[PDB]
Design a protein around this ligand. Structure first.
Ligand SMILES: N#Cc1cccc(C(=O)NS(=O)(=O)OC[C@H]2O[C@@H](n3cnc4c(N)ncnc43)[C@H](O)[C@@H]2O)c1
Length: 521
């Protein structure tokens, strides 16, 4: 599986400092293989570590019997269900590298992922609108003929994922890829018209999980609510569910971040940490204002907020109105995660996005032509380190743009750094809408819009929104009358996730040639 390696002097240093341990990610689970403490709670279901590891082995073995092999790829689409984790570990034990699509993703996104990775295996959920029947499956499996095996959650037919999980593995031995090779693919936010995949090696991903565990002080006492989409990296690894498993704690799954679902799960299971994006935080606080008892949240000790910038106003209200500590998390799937620390001053927790997890994360701020700027100045985030990738999968053209000559990645973010060394996020250069933490590549949607018979020119831009931070607005130059609902129905036909439909559509008599900077004025 081809990916961009670190230069040999970097690998060598990162091993010498102990960052790269050359253990597979399977070891996060197998170190607890003999434990009957609870690893996952999913509704009424409670899975121990012993059971979780046995389930992954059963699934792996079963897939192996069906002919799936090490070095192959898989496409997986599961939401906040225990079978996400079983599946992730089963594929790791086989040496098969998955993309974990979010439940919300639709035809265009799944098609794009499958086209790039040519998966031998598809795992999905009949609860998803695409997979309740067999029509789409038929089309999908025809247009991506690399697929040999299909397993489905909530199926009772011959493709029942549960039959595999429940089938005791006879004589199974795990064959994870080497630790310095690819374990799985993460998804980028998106800055371009086609999705970009981020190869993650065992060494590099395990380090980001293990170091996050130290910073967040997770142990067997950790009871972690995973309520945002579980397969996103913030939920998975910062420290996320994998950090919880590493530390032997418990992950409580919720279908979404609503107060209605989560206030009860927090009280019931005595959750002590969770992870939110800013709007979820406002909604929780407003739920408390509307009368939910604050006592349902007593057990909560740490709340992480990330994905988009938390305002200081909103941040301050957390210890006050909820009574736990805040941790700001400013991370990206490409690598680099900055944390405020548990012993930081209130000033740093409230006003900054923290600093890098690793002492050898190298972060500098560039001006427009690639030159360093002194501290305090606002500029482009440039970075490299032991868990930051060196290239998107099979994307030479785009890789040429995304990295400088020395291997620094440019995250498309504008930042400034404190005298004390802390990062504040000040704006953005990449052509991307951050809608309450979820990422929308404007060019992707603009390309889809131009496919409309009536649309001559298309621009997608973010607009301030109090709750969501940013909402999306499509500016169109049209041949003919065109209402928002027509655009939205059309896009939905193309098959994209709901969160990517424009919140707002305006037909305009003209647009500048599209010069978005000028449009903002
Ligand atoms: N592995 C991982 C991980 C951990 C926490 C958050 C994220 C994340 O949001 N990743 S992303 O791949 O969906 O996109 C990252 C982009 O989110 C933005 N971001 C993210 N956290 C902030 C922030 N705290 N303030 C302001 N902008 C932010 C920033 O633009 C960054 O480049 C990923």
């Amino acid at each position: 599986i081809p990916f961009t390696r670190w230069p040999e002097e970097f690998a060598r240093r990162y091993r010498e400092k102990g960052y790269w341990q050359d253990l597979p990610l399977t070891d996060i689970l197998t170190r607890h293989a003999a434990s009957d403490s609870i690893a996952v709670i999913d509704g009424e279901r409670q899975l121990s570590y012993r059971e979780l590891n046995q389930a992954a082995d059963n699934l792996a073995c079963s897939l192996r019997r069906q002919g799936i092999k090490p070095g192959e790829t898989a496409l997986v689409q599961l939401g906040n269900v225990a079978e996400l984790y079983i599946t992730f570990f089963a594929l790791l034990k086989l040496g098969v590298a998955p993309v974990l699509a979010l439940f919300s993703h639709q035809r265009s996104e799944l098609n794009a992922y499958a086209s790039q990775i040519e998966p031998a295996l598809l795992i999905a959920d009949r609860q998803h609108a695409l997979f309740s029947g067999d029509d789409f499956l038929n089309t999908f499996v025809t247009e991506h003929s690399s697929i040999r095996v299909v397993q489905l959650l909530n199926d009772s037919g011959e493709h029942n994922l549960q039959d595999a999980i429940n089938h005791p593995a006879e004589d199974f031995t795990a064959t994870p890829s080497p630790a310095d090779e690819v374990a799985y693919f993460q998804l980028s936010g998106g800055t371009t018209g086609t999705p970009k995949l981020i190869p993650r090696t065992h060494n590099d991903y395990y380090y980001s999980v293990r170091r996050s565990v130290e910073i967040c002080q997770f142990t067997q006492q950790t009871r972690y609510l995973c309520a945002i989409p579980a397969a996103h990296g913030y939920a998975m690894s910062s420290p996320g569910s994998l950090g919880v498993f590493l530390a032997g704690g418990t992950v409580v799954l919720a279908a979404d971040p609503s107060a209605t679902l989560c206030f009860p799960l927090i009280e019931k299971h005595q959750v002590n940490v969770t992870a939110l994006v800013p709007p979820a935080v406002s909604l929780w606080l407003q739920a408390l204002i509307e009368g939910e008892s604050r006592a349902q949240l007593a057990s909560l000790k740490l709340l992480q907020v990330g994905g988009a910038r938390l305002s200081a106003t909103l941040a301050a209200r957390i210890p006050a109105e909820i009574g736990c500590q805040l941790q700001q998390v400013f991370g990206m799937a490409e690598g680099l995660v900055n944390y405020t620390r548990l012993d930081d001053s209130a000033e740093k927790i409230i006003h900054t996005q923290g600093y890098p997890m690793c002492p050898d994360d190298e972060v500098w701020v560039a001006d427009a032509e690639g030159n360093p700027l002194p501290q305090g100045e606002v500029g482009r985030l440039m970075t490299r380190g032991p868990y930051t990738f060196r290239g998107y999968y099979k994307s030479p053209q785009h890789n040429a743009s995304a990295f400088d000559a020395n291997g620094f990645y440019c995250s498309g973010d504008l930042i400034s750094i404190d005298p004390e060394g802390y990062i504040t996020v000040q704006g953005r250069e990449k052509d991307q809408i951050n809608r309450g933490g979820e990422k929308i590549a404007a060019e992707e949607i603009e390309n889809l819009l131009l496919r409309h018979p009536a649309v001559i020119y298309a621009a997608l831009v973010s607009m301030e929104d109090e709750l969501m931070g940013e909402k999306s607005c499509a500016y169109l130059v049209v041949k003919e009358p065109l209402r928002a609902v027509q655009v939205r129905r059309f896009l939905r036909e193309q098959g994209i996730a709901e969160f990517k439909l424009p919140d707002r559509v305006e037909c305009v008599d003209s647009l500048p040639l599209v010069d978005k900077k000028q449009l903002r004025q």
